[PDB]
Amino acid sequence: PISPIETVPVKLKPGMDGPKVKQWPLTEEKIKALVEICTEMEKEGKISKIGPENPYNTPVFAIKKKDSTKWRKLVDFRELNKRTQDFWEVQLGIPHPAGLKKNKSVTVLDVGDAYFSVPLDEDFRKYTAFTIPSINNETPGIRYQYNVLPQGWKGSPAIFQSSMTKILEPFRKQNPDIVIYQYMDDLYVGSDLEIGQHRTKIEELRQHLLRWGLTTPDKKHQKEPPFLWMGYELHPDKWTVQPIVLPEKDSWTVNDIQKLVGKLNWASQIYPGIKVRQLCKLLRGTKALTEVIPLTEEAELELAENREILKEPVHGVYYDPSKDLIAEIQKQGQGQWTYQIYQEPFKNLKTGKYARMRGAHTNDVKQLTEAVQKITTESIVIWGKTPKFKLPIQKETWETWWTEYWQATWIPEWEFVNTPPLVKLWYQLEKEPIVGAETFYVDGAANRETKLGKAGYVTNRGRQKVVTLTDTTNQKTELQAIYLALQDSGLEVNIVTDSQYALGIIQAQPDQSESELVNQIIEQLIKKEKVYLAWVPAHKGIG
Amino acid sequence: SPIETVPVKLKPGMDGPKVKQWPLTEEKIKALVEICTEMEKEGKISKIGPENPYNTPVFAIKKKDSTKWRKLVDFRELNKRTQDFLGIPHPAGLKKNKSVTVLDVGDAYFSVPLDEDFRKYTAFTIPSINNETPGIRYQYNVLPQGWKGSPAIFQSSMTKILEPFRKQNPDIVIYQYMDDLYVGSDLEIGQHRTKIEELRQHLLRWGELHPDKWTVQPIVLPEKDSWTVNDIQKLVGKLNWASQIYPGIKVRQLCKLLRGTKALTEVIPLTEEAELELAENREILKEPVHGVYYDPSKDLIAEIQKQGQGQWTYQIYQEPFKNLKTGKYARMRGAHTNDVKQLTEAVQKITTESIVIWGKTPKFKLPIQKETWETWWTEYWQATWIPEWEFVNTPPLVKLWYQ
Numbered sequence: 001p002i003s004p005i006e007t008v009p010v011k012l013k014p015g016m017d018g019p020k021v022k023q024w025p026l027t028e029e030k031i032k033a034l035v036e037i038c039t040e041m042e043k044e045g046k047i048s049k050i051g052p053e054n055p056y057n058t059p060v061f062a063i064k065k066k067d068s069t070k071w072r073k074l075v076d077f078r079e080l081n082k083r084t085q086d087f088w089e090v091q092l093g094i095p096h097p098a099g100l101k102k103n104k105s106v107t108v109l110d111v112g113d114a115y116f117s118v119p120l121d122e123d124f125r126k127y128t129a130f131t132i133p134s135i136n137n138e139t140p141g142i143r144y145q146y147n148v149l150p151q152g153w154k155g156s157p158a159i160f161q162s163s164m165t166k167i168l169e170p171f172r173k174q175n176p177d178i179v180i181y182q183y184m185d186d187l188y189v190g191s192d193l194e195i196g197q198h199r200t201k202i203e204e205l206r207q208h209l210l211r212w213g214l215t216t217p218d219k220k221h222q223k224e225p226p227f228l229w230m231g232y233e234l235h236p237d238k239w240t241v242q243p244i245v246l247p248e249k250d251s252w253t254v255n256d257i258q259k260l261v262g263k264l265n266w267a268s269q270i271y272p273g274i275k276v277r278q279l280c281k282l283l284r285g286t287k288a289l290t291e292v293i294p295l296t297e298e299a300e301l302e303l304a305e306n307r308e309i310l311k312e313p314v315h316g317v318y319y320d321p322s323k324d325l326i327a328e329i330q331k332q333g334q335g336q337w338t339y340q341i342y343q344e345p346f347k348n349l350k351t352g353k354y355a356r357m358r359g360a361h362t363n364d365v366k367q368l369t370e371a372v373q374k375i376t377t378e379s380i381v382i383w384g385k386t387p388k389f390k391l392p393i394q395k396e397t398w399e400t401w402w403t404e405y406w407q408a409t410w411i412p413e414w415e416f417v418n419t420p421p422l423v424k425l426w427y428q429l430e431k432e433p434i435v436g437a438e439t440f441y442v443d444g445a446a447n448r449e450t451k452l453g454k455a456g457y458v459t460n461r462g463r464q465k466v467v468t469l470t471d472t473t474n475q476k477t478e479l480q481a482i483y484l485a486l487q488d489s490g491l492e493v494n495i496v497t498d499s500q501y502a503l504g505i506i507q508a509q510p511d512q513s514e515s516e517l518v519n520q521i522i523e524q525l526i527k528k529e530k531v532y533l534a535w536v537p538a539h540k541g542i543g
Numbered sequence: 544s545p546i547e548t549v550p551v552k553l554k555p556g557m558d559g560p561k562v563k564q565w566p567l568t569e570e571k572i573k574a575l576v577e578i579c580t581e582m583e584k585e586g587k588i589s590k591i592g593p594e595n596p597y598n599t600p601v602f603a604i605k606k607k608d609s610t611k612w613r614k615l616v617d618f619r620e621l622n623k624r625t626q627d628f629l630g631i632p633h634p635a636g637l638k639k640n641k642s643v644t645v646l647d648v649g650d651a652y653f654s655v656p657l658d659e660d661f662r663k664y665t666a667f668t669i670p671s672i673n674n675e676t677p678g679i680r681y682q683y684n685v686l687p688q689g690w691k692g693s694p695a696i697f698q699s700s701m702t703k704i705l706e707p708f709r710k711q712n713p714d715i716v717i718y719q720y721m722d723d724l725y726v727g728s729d730l731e732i733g734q735h736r737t738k739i740e741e742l743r744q745h746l747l748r749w750g751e752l753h754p755d756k757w758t759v760q761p762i763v764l765p766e767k768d769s770w771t772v773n774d775i776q777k778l779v780g781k782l783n784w785a786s787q788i789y790p791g792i793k794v795r796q797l798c799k800l801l802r803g804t805k806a807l808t809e810v811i812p813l814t815e816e817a818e819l820e821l822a823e824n825r826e827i828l829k830e831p832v833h834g835v836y837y838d839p840s841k842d843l844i845a846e847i848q849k850q851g852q853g854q855w856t857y858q859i860y861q862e863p864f865k866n867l868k869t870g871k872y873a874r875m876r877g878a879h880t881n882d883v884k885q886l887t888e889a890v891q892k893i894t895t896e897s898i899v900i901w902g903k904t905p906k907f908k909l910p911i912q913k914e915t916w917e918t919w920w921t922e923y924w925q926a927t928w929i930p931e932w933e934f935v936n937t938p939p940l941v942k943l944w945y946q
């Protein structure tokens with residue numbers, strides 16, 4: 001079955017010439033097969049015989065397809081694939097089940113062999129030349145060249161999709177009520193028609209595909225739901241998490257632990273509650289992938305507690321365009337967020353989790369923002385719209401923060417949902433000096449070379465202190481300076497510094513950092529009642 | 544309906560842009576597919592296969608003056624790899640004009656065809672929700688709007704079309720920047736608006752703005768009756784920083800007042816010397832620094848700072864501290880809750896002035912996270928062009944200053 005669609009013009013990479021490879025010496029059997037095989041597609045029109053006017057060649061092989069003692073072939077286009085031009089990206093993006101709509105019935109039509117159905121570019125064919133070996137290398141070489149898309153060739157996938165995309169455009173317009181997801185050599189067709197009516201349309205489309213030479217399996221060979229889709233198992237009315245099985249075992253190797261955390265982490269998305277903290281600790285210092293590790297009981301408790309979470313599978317439902325989208329977010333740990341997108345409460349579409357490492361110096365609100373942003377995007381990619389958000393943050397809070405942050409930020413129409421823990425600002429710097437408050441003139445500096453330093457302060461109330469630091473850097477000095485001022489201060493303080501780093505860091509009301517010291521300061525700040533922080537030029541000899 | 548097409552090429556060695564399309568909302572996709580089927584009928588653009596490896600991002604916006612959607616392509620990458628070039632001049636006229644009105648003339652281009660061999664370089668793609676399908680691939684056959692090569696090639700045609708109005712109304716300035724046409728006159732609002740409607744018809748037959756009103760805002764120094772240790776501190780901080788623009792500024796006399804571990808709240812009187820040092824400074828800041836001249840051969844830069852409460856500040860310079868112009872901006876009525884809105888409005892206003900004054904888009908340094916901007920800027924854009932931009936972290940100092 002050969003296709004009548006127009007061929008895609010193909011060209012070799014800028015200034016390169018076709019493959020000039022050899023044709024491995026074969027056994028009487030291997031040659032016997034190929035000859036028969038070729039003669040088969042030869043009559044089919046798949047390949048044709050080419051004269052000596054073709055100086056190209058690609059190595060051909062013969063392998064007995066496992067399960068069948070019958071001979072099968074294979075052509076090595078590696079060389080060709082290198083010399084071939086680039087095409088557009090074949091995978092725009094993965095269709096996520098949560099994006100699928102609910103259908104009464106659906107059937108998948110595996111096309112597969114269709115490759116050999118799509119005609120190759122008339123002019124490019126010559127480069128697809130290959131030769132058959134004579135048992136003892138008598139005299140000639142029974143040459144052929146590909147006359148259609150070749151298995152394993154670079155272009156095949158790319159070009160097949162297109163063709164497939166075209167051969168479907170007409171049908172796509174006619175039966176809008178019908179859905180068809182294109183994906184590799186699979187054709188996913190779902191609808192809301194009554195089963196019989198559906199089977200009909202299937203055949204209709206099926207014949208349509210056949211109208212262009214595309215051979216597909218009939219009803220009696222079509223695969224039926226539920227469908228094994230990347231991690232998910234989906235039925236016409238719902239999708240389900242293909243329950244995860246954790247191999248219970250004696251000894252554990254490093255490698256094993258990795259793969260475990262792999263699986264485990266992937267599941268964190270769906271089963272929030274999964275933990276790997278202890279499990280991850282086992283890697284520390286690992287010398288070999290095949291090294292075995294003594295699973296700590298803490299890791300035992302955790303690993304077990306997981307096997308339970310991964311017990312109760314959880315189903316989910318599909319997208320209903322008529323319904324608006326609702327995304328809700330919860331704060332799990334520090335910089336650990338969970339969200340779910342549902343159209344009807346408890347009836348989830350998707351759920352994920354995010355873990356934003358300490359980064360540098362960030363805060364919860366910012367983070368939240370980053371999540372909303374991330375989620376927003378997923379949404380535009382899956383459903384084309386952005387969900388209304390239900391956020392654990394007081395409108396007053398959000399307002400106070402964004403109107404005063406230096407960077408442009410924003411959250412789409414969202415609504416406060418009183419579901420603790422709520423995100424809040426852990427402190428705020430006074431806008432002006434605190435009247436009747438001690439004033440600390442903190443300074444810090446360290447010898448970049450020796451890493452020796454002093455940090456200290458003096459106040460309007462005559463108090464003072466200084467400290468010499470070993471193995472430090474200038475910036476840790478400036479911060480330390482401030483830490484002291486915060487320690488020895490008391491509920492209310494005015495702190496002037498000449499440090500720009502700090503003024504920066506803190507003024508950005510961060511509530512978490514990579515730097516322990518900052519964390520220290522931060523804690524100290526939350527503790528205070530009122531803190532005013534001022535900056536002044538350094539080496540200007542001020543106060 | 545073709546004409547003899549001019550041959551265009553990419554700068555030597557360069558290859559076609561291959562830019563990934565950003566996910567688009569449903570609402571936008573529809574607008575596009577609709578907008579493109581018709582353009583395909585009309586033979587403007589044509590579907591293309593996979594054998595075309597290039598791509599340029601595409602999307603849709605809608606100006607206030609129109610509830611209908613408008614397609615926009617991001618040729619920034621393509622424009623950048625396109626050969627330069629018969630010419631396109633820039634006047635200093637409208638820079639002074641009383642009133643200028645911008646006209647979206649993009650349309651004209653679609654009349655002119657595009658050199659076969661180059662067309663491949665305009666392949667763009669319309670995405671499918673949840674990737675149900677490999678997006679749609681098109682490629683222009685005519686001059687694309689927003690491509691630097693279009694106003695050029697359509698140079699001839701344009702000049703002609705205009706000449707009448709030109710020397711017939713010479714008391715008017717006409718500038719063209721890509722898909723836009725800037726018209727400036729000192730003729731009072733009545734005549735200006737009517738003359739404009741007059742010119743429209745002239746073009747249609749074929750197929751508010753106020754310069755000077757924009758004066759670089761001087762850096763003002765606050766006046767107190769009494770000063771607190773903090774007040775002087777804040778002040779000295781600003782001047783110190785400002786000496787970078789005016790080396791004339793001195794701060795020693797005030798720094799003297801700050802000697803001692805005093806309480807920020809403590810009140811302090813000014814020595815007659817500090818009174819002078821200050822007064823003298825005030826004067827210096829009364830005018831923009833000497834020696835700042837627009838160097839056409841260098842990149843123009845725009846820096847913006849969120850001042851909050853709705854305000855934003857920005858500066859255009861080629862060399863740090865040698866601003867060509869600085870300004871402020873108060874959020875448009877309505878963007879009262881969303882920054883991105885404002886920032887995109889702000890960027891656009893500036894890019895415009897830029898064009899008006901130097902006929903060159905500034906490169907923007909934006910106070911926002913990339914992710915944020917990329918996610919929502921398209922929602923508020925209403926300009927045919929797209930300037931270059933980078934994201935940064937506003938050094939609080941450069942902020943208090945312009946405040």
Ligand SMILES: O=C1Nc2ccc(Cl)cc2[C@@](C#CC2CC2)(C(F)(F)F)O1
Nearest residue numbers: 100101106179181188189190234235236
């Ligand atoms: O939007 C829907 N609805 C749907 C509902 C249940 C199932 Cl099991 C499958 C689908 C479907 C798909 C698909 C694979 C490509 C992902 C189909 F296209 F209909 F086949 O996409």
